[PDB]
Amino acid sequence: ATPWQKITQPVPGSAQSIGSFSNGCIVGADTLPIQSEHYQVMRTDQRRYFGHPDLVMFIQRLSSQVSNLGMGTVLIGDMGMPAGGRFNGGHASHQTGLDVDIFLQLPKTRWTSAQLLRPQALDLVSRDGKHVVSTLWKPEIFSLIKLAAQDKDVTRIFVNPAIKQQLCLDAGTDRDWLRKVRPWFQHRAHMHVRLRCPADSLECEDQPLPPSGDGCGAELQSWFELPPSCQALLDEHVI
């Protein structure tokens, strides 16, 4: 119902993320190419494949790595609307073009348009919510999340508490990256990736670092039991 949810073209300008992840917008958003050899775009009918150049580059960079490891094709979910803003339906952030949802399934064969248009969600989390379905969990999903968490531009990765629990178990020695993995409601089929504010973006609000430690103990366990600049775009009918 908002102008943000109605515009179909990005606001032309210098790429600028404005506000915070959960209250803001983005001017000069870039558009993720639809055709790629390393990834595919889901639910393009929602028109949520826009974002900051940094988000686009991270996707291209992450998808190229997965491909070169022969793990499959990346499936890209919600990014941001043409000018950012709150989603009518879906996660609550993604407002500044720095958040991207990625399916926790790596097809080894490209999906068809119909499949991408209406994805068949693969519920990983157990029926009670404390573990992952062992017959669906693949080593590639572990790798996918670890690779993402290792990018210097990524600050946080939100997944269901059960998924992080399966990660805590498989991490072994190399586990500082686990700190970037944060538990949250749902996120049973997608991992939510959030990037740091772009260096040159002056009206972007960053988040403190996450708690210290892998976070695999008590905190995880607790789970098992408008910016003037944006408003201006409205006040002047630019959206």
Q: Is 238 helix (H, G, I), strand (E, B) or coil?
A: coil
Judged by beta carbon distances under 5 to 8 A according to partner kind, the member of Zn ion, its own copies, none in contact with residue 101 is: Zn ion
- Rounded to whole angstroms, the Cα distance separating 22 from 87 reads 10
Distances (CA, A) of 225 to 65, 161, 221: 37, 11, 7
Q: Please identify which residue in the block is written with the tokens 């491909």.
A: 67
Q: Where are the beta strands (DSSP E) in 48-141?
A: 50-51, 74-76, 99-103
Among the candidate windows 20-28, 60-68, 76-84, 212-220, which touches its own copies by CB under 8 A? 212-220
As a 3-state breakdown, the chain gives helix, strand, coil percent values, each rounded to 5, of: 30, 20, 55
Judged by beta carbon distances under 5 to 8 A according to partner kind, the member of Zn ion, its own copies, none in contact with residue 135 is: its own copies
Of the candidates 69, 121, 136, 169, which one interacts with its own copies according to CB under 8 A? 169
101 forms part of the interface with Zn ion (CB under 5 A): yes
Q: Are 91 and 192 in contact (CB under 8 A)?
A: yes
Is 94 labelled as part of a ligand binding site?
Answer: yes
Judged by beta carbon distances under 5 to 8 A according to partner kind, the member of Zn ion, its own copies, none in contact with residue 192 is: Zn ion
Residues near Zn ion (CB under 5 A) are: 91, 101, 128, 130, 192
- Binding site, annotated residues for Zn(2+): 91, 94, 101, 128, 131, 192
Residues near its own copies (CB under 8 A) are: 126, 128, 130-131, 134-135, 165, 168-173, 175, 213-214, 216-218, 220-221, 224-225
